[PDB]
Scaffold this active site. Structure first.
Site, PDB file in Angstrom:
ATOM      1  N   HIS A  24      24.559  -1.666  26.228  1.00  0.00           N
ATOM      2  CA  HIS A  24      25.485  -1.092  27.200  1.00  0.00           C
ATOM      3  C   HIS A  24      26.898  -1.368  26.694  1.00  0.00           C
ATOM      4  CE1 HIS A  24      21.907  -2.410  29.817  1.00  0.00           C
ATOM      5  NE2 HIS A  24      21.704  -1.163  29.434  1.00  0.00           N
TER       6      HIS A  24
HETATM    7  C1  LIG Z   1      16.874   0.795  23.758  1.00  0.00           C
HETATM    8  C2  LIG Z   1      17.972   1.207  24.703  1.00  0.00           C
HETATM    9  C3  LIG Z   1      17.723   1.292  26.050  1.00  0.00           C
HETATM   10  C4  LIG Z   1      18.727   1.673  26.955  1.00  0.00           C
HETATM   11  N1  LIG Z   1      18.405   1.737  28.282  1.00  0.00           N
HETATM   12  C5  LIG Z   1      19.348   2.092  29.111  1.00  0.00           C
HETATM   13  C6  LIG Z   1      19.041   2.164  30.474  1.00  0.00           C
HETATM   14  O1  LIG Z   1      17.929   1.908  30.908  1.00  0.00           O
HETATM   15  N2  LIG Z   1      20.039   2.535  31.336  1.00  0.00           N
HETATM   16  C7  LIG Z   1      21.285   2.830  30.903  1.00  0.00           C
HETATM   17  O2  LIG Z   1      22.106   3.147  31.759  1.00  0.00           O
HETATM   18  N3  LIG Z   1      21.626   2.772  29.597  1.00  0.00           N
HETATM   19  C8  LIG Z   1      20.698   2.420  28.735  1.00  0.00           C
HETATM   20  N4  LIG Z   1      20.994   2.347  27.386  1.00  0.00           N
HETATM   21  C9  LIG Z   1      22.354   2.669  26.915  1.00  0.00           C
HETATM   22  C10 LIG Z   1      22.536   4.153  26.664  1.00  0.00           C
HETATM   23  O3  LIG Z   1      21.684   4.577  25.609  1.00  0.00           O
HETATM   24  C11 LIG Z   1      23.984   4.508  26.317  1.00  0.00           C
HETATM   25  O4  LIG Z   1      24.852   3.909  27.268  1.00  0.00           O
HETATM   26  C12 LIG Z   1      24.218   6.020  26.322  1.00  0.00           C
HETATM   27  O5  LIG Z   1      23.534   6.611  25.216  1.00  0.00           O
HETATM   28  C13 LIG Z   1      25.678   6.406  26.277  1.00  0.00           C
HETATM   29  O6  LIG Z   1      26.035   6.743  24.913  1.00  0.00           O
HETATM   30  P1  LIG Z   1      27.238   7.770  24.646  1.00  0.00           P
HETATM   31  O7  LIG Z   1      26.940   9.057  25.337  1.00  0.00           O
HETATM   32  O8  LIG Z   1      28.531   7.082  24.933  1.00  0.00           O
HETATM   33  O9  LIG Z   1      27.084   7.981  23.065  1.00  0.00           O
HETATM   34  P2  LIG Z   1      25.775   8.063  22.147  1.00  0.00           P
HETATM   35  O10 LIG Z   1      24.773   8.934  22.826  1.00  0.00           O
HETATM   36  O11 LIG Z   1      25.364   6.681  21.767  1.00  0.00           O
HETATM   37  O12 LIG Z   1      26.338   8.823  20.854  1.00  0.00           O
HETATM   38  C14 LIG Z   1      26.914  10.137  21.042  1.00  0.00           C
HETATM   39  C15 LIG Z   1      26.971  10.857  19.719  1.00  0.00           C
HETATM   40  O13 LIG Z   1      28.185  10.523  19.008  1.00  0.00           O
HETATM   41  C16 LIG Z   1      27.953  10.904  17.677  1.00  0.00           C
HETATM   42  N5  LIG Z   1      29.030  10.385  16.847  1.00  0.00           N
HETATM   43  C17 LIG Z   1      29.363   9.075  16.616  1.00  0.00           C
HETATM   44  N6  LIG Z   1      30.393   8.950  15.812  1.00  0.00           N
HETATM   45  C18 LIG Z   1      30.752  10.254  15.495  1.00  0.00           C
HETATM   46  C19 LIG Z   1      31.767  10.794  14.684  1.00  0.00           C
HETATM   47  N7  LIG Z   1      32.647  10.060  14.010  1.00  0.00           N
HETATM   48  N8  LIG Z   1      31.836  12.143  14.592  1.00  0.00           N
HETATM   49  C20 LIG Z   1      30.947  12.879  15.270  1.00  0.00           C
HETATM   50  N9  LIG Z   1      29.956  12.483  16.062  1.00  0.00           N
HETATM   51  C21 LIG Z   1      29.914  11.143  16.131  1.00  0.00           C
HETATM   52  C22 LIG Z   1      26.574  10.322  17.388  1.00  0.00           C
HETATM   53  O14 LIG Z   1      25.939  10.900  16.268  1.00  0.00           O
HETATM   54  C23 LIG Z   1      25.841  10.556  18.719  1.00  0.00           C
HETATM   55  O15 LIG Z   1      24.940  11.653  18.659  1.00  0.00           O
HETATM   56  C24 LIG Z   1      20.015   1.973  26.470  1.00  0.00           C
HETATM   57  C25 LIG Z   1      20.257   1.881  25.091  1.00  0.00           C
HETATM   58  C26 LIG Z   1      19.261   1.506  24.216  1.00  0.00           C
HETATM   59  C27 LIG Z   1      19.555   1.411  22.742  1.00  0.00           C
END
Ligand SMILES: Cc1cc2nc3c(=O)[nH]c(=O)nc-3n(C[C@H](O)[C@H](O)[C@H](O)COP(=O)(O)OP(=O)(O)OC[C@H]3O[C@@H](n4cnc5c(N)ncnc54)[C@H](O)[C@@H]3O)c2cc1C
Ligand SMILES: COC1=C(OC)C(=O)C(C/C=C(\C)CC/C=C(\C)CC/C=C(\C)CC/C=C(\C)CC/C=C(\C)CC/C=C(\C)CC/C=C(\C)CC/C=C(\C)CC/C=C(\C)CCC=C(C)C)=C(C)C1=O
Ligand code: HEC
Ligand code: HEC
Ligand code: HEC
Ligand code: F3S
Lengths: 413, 136, 539
Positions: C475
């Protein structure tokens, strides 16, 4: 409920005049994918301005049984008035009373139906009706048979209009009474043979199985999907047990129409004791977004084996149907199997919802290409369903397009 | 066909379960032969030990072969049949999942994850007793 | 060659894809860029099924997702060195991320949580941490919108004392407990702990055209049937509405004009070919790790220390939920595996007056099936014959996994500087995090360990194994903190950077407090709030 309400339920007149699960009741606006284009159901609520509130009994009867609007314009045969023609006068009056006094008016115009030339003009439907032999006397009981058979025939032919989908159409898109209930293609889906043929039709079905399928759409050998799921969940699940029993009684007397190349019933196909190889999948690790997974068994295991088990026998409690001994996989025509893969199954009976996720291009769970769907369907047919049936990517593309284009639709080009 | 038949018979004796997948057994035998070039000889020697000493089950053979050099190969065969892997690293090849013997003692209760148990709400039912070995 | 759009979003995760879907639904032209590749759910399922059973017993959530050399993500069983962690609690930030269209939500447990109203004014209530730039009442409509979009089920009719107030019920009602959750609830209720259902973005009934959850018990790392929410759903919906998605688009540079507004960004393809993108509004929705890394990597002459880093706070205040793991063999059978992997948790200690002294914690029971763990452990014991089967059955019936997550305060020394020692195939430096749990979390853990000991003793646990270190929970919050003062924050209450009026950071790095439960639902709500701000700006 009132007699008119029951007649409206049995006739399923609300499944098409309501846009959907979240559409206004009897307000029309539902798109019917006719071979020549989209035909929209009209507003039916007794709105004196936007509905049929100004209709008299005679005008309503004309619209319901002869396909003539209030102004005299010919109704498109997406209206099953060829089925409602033989409705009794009392039933028409009861339906009119239910529409006028039990349905709340909706003041919202429905989309207009715009068909390409020469189908744009709704005046050629006169000699089309002449050539379709639509006209016929109101239904009367056949005293040679018992009351159950007569009521079942009335429900099948006049109210529930099963022949609208299960009886194939001729060149002029008119019912082919020679092949009565012999099975038809209704677009992306195919209504199977439901005659008394032991192998081609539903003759080998048990009475309990047929009753359960009609009432709920769920049976150990068959599950309702597509248009039949809608028919069951909007009309057939609300019918009394006596009505379903009468329908079964009439169906058991339908003359058999055999299919070409049929030797066993659609639910009597045993499953081959074969499956994929876990060892062969090791090379496909580090290979995200499967494109190199061209094996049918591997594709079925990755996409479908989670619910329908690897042997294809489904779950023990029967929530996930057994692909072995299933009428959809056991059909010689794999149209229903391709349609099920493309669109899934969605049937809500007794406020409880079945759902198969869709696996077509618009899928959220796992989009599949035409080649992948064809390979999976071939594996299912060879191992769980009809081994004599085959699926090509072109067939999947055709099912996606809305089925084979009828020859009459070529005139609009 | 002699080598695979001997391997399958020895596997049925060692795991204590007759119903073993033939394709999984063939893949395991090929992988073992690739890893050990004399694996067929060790299988044959284990079979001669079983026949000569007349071991009723794998318990007696394991008890009487604790220090014998063939014990590691027997334990490796049992581990390969139960876990579905032969090596012990992250990129080890998996030859059996949902058919590996270590998921079978709890199949009647515990789900093998990516494969569904019967229905979307089956877990509301009480589980079976731990003292009842299901099947297989 | 110019790749123009009204709004370009960097990162097709849950935040980026939800924002893109909301924007295209309102008539905006959206370009969605992701550094990782497109991923198929069924292929990930096959990869997990062929993952070795030892990687299933120990929770390997990254191997099923192949790591692309141009945009690598974290893997810990081989332990690739993409994310370097330093500090006394480096083990607490060994976090898993997935790069690709869909992001880390591909393999999350889908525990969609609403933060308490005090989680937004932690500093004003207890004198520790930082206050959010907005209150809970301001994020409540976006919370509900995210819950409806993702299909979150929850305990609709139920009084949970430490729970966020709701204006509307959950879109779905929580599915019934499995045997393990019921037994754990009874045991901890006798122990004085309140075990309540976890709100999950899971289908207790057919929802959004997706099947009802059949208890595959593999929510991390992949659902075989799509009965839980993944950000790939929002990406697909946005693409269907007209959003253009470019996978394998590793953004590395940003250009600013005399007014410090971003005029263009550049991204690399796997062959290190640069493509320029021009847009009216720029959004970075990458991660709590990747967003600060991109901001620091794209330092200009006008922004020598990094984009939107006038406060020197980009990459600082890194936060997570430090966890303490517990494994033991319950005296009575627990039969873990009925339902989802995370069905319930102890929400008793989510709030209280103690939060001015030590961290509020969340104690939970892991519902992942123990058949793989039991099989591997029994095989490691050198058992044979019927004894082996009996041991496997006993250990899968009695195996229990227990955790306790804590809240960490935003510490400026918890940083994400760019590593000077490691790079990737595109030459971009690897992220490097120095993590210290702090006396807040240490004092919380001194009591959490006793609570876990009490839970194990109440269950008659044997072979008790507590992790001597702190475990990560992925998180990732903080890094671009939000606030009102531009000198003490990176973005404002609308997730718009103070330095650049053109740039929005729709990520968890904006959250000023880690809270006590999973924070992705708050991230989605903040992304929808930023979508509203962008729509107001461009119309
Ligand atoms: C095993 C596990 C279990 C989890 N369980 C929970 C849960 O039960 N409940 C919960 O609320 N949260 C949970 N989480 C956390 C949750 O996965 C993240 O909070 C959520 O994915 C939010 O990520 P995000 O959308 O900010 O970015 P992400 O989805 O992590 O990444 C977004 C995208 O950014 C892209 N990116 C990165 N850098 C660049 C760049 N320079 N240029 C272009 N693209 C780029 C990546 O390729 C990726 O596809 C869990 C995480 C894990 C690992
Ligand atoms: C003026 O020139 C012409 C004429 O007159 C000289 C003609 O008469 C004709 C003949 C053809 C027509 C007049 C077309 C008439 C028919 C339609 C416009 C549409 C017909 C549609 C159906 C019968 C659909 C039936 C299918 C069903 C029931 C499938 C199941 C339904 C659902 C799933 C819902 C032609 C070609 C012509 O050119
Ligand atoms: C993936 C490659 C596949 C294939 C080839 C099939 N399915 Fe499913 N399916 C599921 C359920 C619950 C139903 C019936 C609806 C109900 O009973 O409520 C079905 C239906 C089918 C059929 C038709 C059966 C019939 O008689 O009409 C066929 C041919 C079929 N399926 C094949 C359940 C699921 C899933 C649940 C998680 C998944 C995944 C799939 N199906 C995927 C596939
Ligand atoms: C379309 C507008 C239909 C109406 C009205 C009725 N049926 Fe139907 N039926 C239809 C389709 C497209 C299918 C198959 C779906 C598929 O998965 O391919 C069916 C199925 C049946 C079956 C099962 C036969 C089999 O699967 O082999 C029976 C017994 C059946 N239908 C009977 C039936 C009766 C008695 C109806 C009204 C009184 C009726 N159907 C309406 C299409 C449509
Ligand atoms: C079951 C009771 C039932 C009643 C009563 C009924 N319908 Fe219709 N109906 C239509 C379509 C399509 C039209 C217009 C077609 C045309 O203009 O030729 C129509 C036209 C009408 C009209 C003419 C009014 C107008 O503005 O066009 C009346 C009245 C009507 N329907 C009543 C599809 C359906 C379908 C489709 C599956 C069902 C079932 C159906 N209708 C069932 C019923
Ligand atoms: S893997 Fe899927 S079927 Fe349910 S238990 Fe998790 S959401």
């Amino acid at each position: 409920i009132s007699r008119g309400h029951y007649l409206a339920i049995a006739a399923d007149c609300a499944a098409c005049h309501t846009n959907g699960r979240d559409g206004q009741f009897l307000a029309g606006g539902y798109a019917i994918s006719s071979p020549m284009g989209n035909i929209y159901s009209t507003n039916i609520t007794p709105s004196k301005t936007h509905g049929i509130g100004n209709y008299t009994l005679e005008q309503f009867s004309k619209a319901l049984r002869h396909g003539i609007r209030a102004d005299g314009a010919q109704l498109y045969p997406a209206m099953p008035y060829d089925a409602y023609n033989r409705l009794t006068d009392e039933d028409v009056k009861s339906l009119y009373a239910y529409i006028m006094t039990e349905v709340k008016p909706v003041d919202a115009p429905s989309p207009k139906t715009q068909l390409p030339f020469p189908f744009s003009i709704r005046a050629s439907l006169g000699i089309w009706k002449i050539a379709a032999r639509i006209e016929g006397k109101p239904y009367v009981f056949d005293h040679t048979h018992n009351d159950d058979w007569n009521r079942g025939r009335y429900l099948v032919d006049e109210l529930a209009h099963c022949g609208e989908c299960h009886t194939p159409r001729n060149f002029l898109l008119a019912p082919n009474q020679s092949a009565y209930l012999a099975g038809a293609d209704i677009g992306s889906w195919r209504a199977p043979n439901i005659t008394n043929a032991p192998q081609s039709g539903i003759g080998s079905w048990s009475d309990q199985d047929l009753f359960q399928y009609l009432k709920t759409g769920k049976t150990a050998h068959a599950r309702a999907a597509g248009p039949m799921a809608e028919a069951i969940e909007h009309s057939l699940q609300y019918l009394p047990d006596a009505d379903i029993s009468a329908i079964v009684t009439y169906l058991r007397s339908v003359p058999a129409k055999a299919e070409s190349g049929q030797t066993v019933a659609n639910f009597e196909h045993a499953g081959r004791p074969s499956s994929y190889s876990v060892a062969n999948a090791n090379s496909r690790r580090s290979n995200s977004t499967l494109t190199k997974t061209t094996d049918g068994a591997a594709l079925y295991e990755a996409v479908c084996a989670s619910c329908h088990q690897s042997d294809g026998k489904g779950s023990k409690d029967g929530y996930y149907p057994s692909l072995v001994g299933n009428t959809t996989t056991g059909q010689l025509n794999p149209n229903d199997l391709i349609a099920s893969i493309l669109y899934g199954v969605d049937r809500t009976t007794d406020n409880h919802e079945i759902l198969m996720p869709a696996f077509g291009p618009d899928s959220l769970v796992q989009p599949l290409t035409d080649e992948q769907i064809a390979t999976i369907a071939d594996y299912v047919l060879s191992h769980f369903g009809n081994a004599q049936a085959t699926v090509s990517a072109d067939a999947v593309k055709q099912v996606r397009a809305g089925g084979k284009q009828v020859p009459l639709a070529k005139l609009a080009s | 066909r002699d080598s695979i038949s001997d391997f399958m018979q020895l596997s049925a004796f060692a795991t204590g379960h007759k119903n073993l997948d033939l394709n999984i057994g063939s893949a395991l035998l090929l992988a073992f032969e690739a890893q050990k070039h004399d694996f067929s000889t060790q299988i044959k020697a284990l079979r001669e030990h079983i026949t000569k000493n007349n071991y009723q089950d794998v318990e007696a053979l394991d008890a009487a072969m604790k220090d014998d050099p063939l014990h590691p190969t027997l334990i490796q065969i049992i581990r390969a049949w139960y876990s579905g892997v032969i090596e012990d690293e992250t990129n080890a090849k998996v030859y059996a999942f949902e058919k590996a013997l270590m998921y079978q003692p709890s199949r009647d209760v515990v789900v093998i994850p990516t494969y569904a148990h019967n229905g979307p709400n089956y877990w509301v039912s009480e589980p079976a007793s731990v003292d009842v070995m299901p099947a297989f | 060659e110019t790749l123009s759009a009204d709004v370009v979003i960097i990162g097709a995760g849950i935040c980026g894809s939800l924002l893109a879907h909301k924007l295209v639904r309102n008539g905006l032209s959206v370009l969605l860029l992701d550094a990782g590749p497109r991923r198929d759910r069924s292929q990930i399922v096959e990869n997990w099924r062929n993952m070795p059973p030892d990687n299933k017993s120990q929770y390997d959530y990254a191997t099923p997702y192949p790591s692309v050399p141009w945009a690598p993500h974290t893997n810990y069983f081989p332990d690739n060195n993409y994310l370097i962690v330093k500090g006394p609690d480096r083990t607490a930030y060994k976090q898993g991320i997935i790069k690709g269209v869909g992001g880390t939500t591909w393999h999350w447990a889908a525990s969609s949580w609403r933060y308490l109203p005090n989680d937004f004014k932690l500093h004003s209530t207890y004198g520790v941490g930082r206050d959010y730039a907005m209150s809970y009442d301001e994020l409540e409509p976006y919370y509900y919108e995210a819950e409806c979009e993702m299909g979150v089920m929850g305990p609709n009719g139920e009084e949970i004392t430490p729970s966020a107030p709701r204006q509307n019920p959950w879109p779905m009602t929580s599915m019934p407990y499995g045997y393990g959750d019921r037994t754990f609830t009874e045991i901890v209720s006798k122990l004085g702990f309140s075990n309540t259902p976890v709100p999950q973005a899971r289908n207790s009934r057919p929802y959004d055209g997706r099947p009802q959850c059949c208890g595959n018990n593999n929510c991390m790392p992949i659902c075989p049937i799509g009965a839980m929410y993944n950000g790939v759903y929002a990406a697909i919906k946005a693409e269907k509405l007209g959003a253009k998605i470019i996978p394998n688009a590793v953004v590395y540079a940003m250009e600013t004009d005399a007014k410090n507004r971003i005029t263009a960004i550049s991204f690399y393809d796997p062959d290190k070919q640069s493509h320029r993108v021009v847009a009216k509004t720029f959004v970075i929705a990458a991660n709590g790790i990747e967003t600060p890394k991109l901001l620091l990597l794209a330092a200009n002459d006008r922004n020598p220390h990094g984009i939107a880093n006038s406060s020197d706070l980009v990459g600082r205040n890194m936060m997570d939920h430090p966890g303490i793991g517990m494994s033991f063999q319950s005296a009575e059978p627990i039969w873990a595996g009925g339902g989802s992997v995370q069905m319930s948790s102890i929400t008793n200690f989510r709030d209280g007056d103690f939060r001015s002294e030590y961290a509020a914690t969340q104690i939970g029971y892991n519902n992942t099936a123990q058949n793989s763990r039991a099989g591997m452990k029994a095989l490691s014991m050198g058992l044979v014959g019927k004894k082996l089967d009996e041991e496997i059955r006993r250990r899968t019936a009695h195996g229990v996994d227990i955790y306790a997550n804590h809240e960490v305060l935003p510490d400026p020394n918890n940083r994400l500087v760019l590593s000077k020692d490691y790079k990737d195939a595109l030459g971009i430096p690897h992220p490097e995090v120095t993590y210290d749990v702090g006396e807040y979390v240490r004092k919380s853990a001194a009591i959490s360990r006793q609570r876990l000991m009490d839970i194990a003793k109440a269950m008659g646990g044997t072979e008790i194994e507590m992790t001597p270190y702190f475990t990560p929970n992925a998180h990732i919050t903080g890094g671009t903190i939000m606030g009102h003062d531009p000198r003490d924050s990176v973005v404002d209450k609308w997730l718009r950077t103070h330095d650049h009026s053109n740039l929005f950071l729709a990520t968890g790095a904006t959250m000023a407090a880690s809270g006590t439960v999973n924070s992705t639902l708050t991230m989605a709500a903040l992304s929808l709030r930023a979508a509203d701000a962008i729509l107001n700006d461009l119309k």
